[PDB]
Amino acid sequence: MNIFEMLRIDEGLRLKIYKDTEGYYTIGIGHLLTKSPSLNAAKSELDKAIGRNCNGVITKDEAEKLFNQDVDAAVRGILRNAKLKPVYDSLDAVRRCALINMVFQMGETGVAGFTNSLRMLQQKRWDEAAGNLAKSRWYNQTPNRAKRVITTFRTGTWDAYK
Ligand SMILES: [Cl-]
Ligand SMILES: [Cl-]
Structure with a gap:
């Protein structure tokens, strides 16, 4: 078991924008997009993040790429x-x-x-x-x-x- 397998169990995987437990716009493997109430504000944040027009949907690969960033950012943030x-x-x-x-x-x-x-x-x-x-x-x-x-x-x- 490693950090990745652990978080994947806790966050799940979803390829389409969804709302998290707190009502926020999320995608992939627990990747928070925006705390704003707008779906449009989420769809724009999403496209900025991926670097394409996604229209609220992403591939598994894209989800993984985001997950790699987030874990790395988390470890660097702790160390800092x-x-x-x-x-x-x-x-x-x-x-x-x-x-x-x-x-x-x-x-x-x-x-x-x-x-x-x-x-x-x-x-x-x-x-x-x-x-x-x-x-x-x-x-x-x-x-x-x-x-x-x-x-x-x-x-x-x-x-x-x-
Ligand atoms: Cl829970
Ligand atoms: Cl308490």
């Missing part, structure tokens, strides 16, 4: 962030994937806001961090996905995805 980098460096390979997963979903700023949970991960207090992380809107909004990520951090194994 003063709050996140130290956490990432203190972690083992499995737990590292769990932090990337959060960052891809919620953005660097959002994750950087879980101060307390971040401090406990850095301290290796697995049970207590799992417990604090569950106390969030994130967990209340997408419970099955958050539980998967949380188990990843508690255990250090790929059990939830298996």
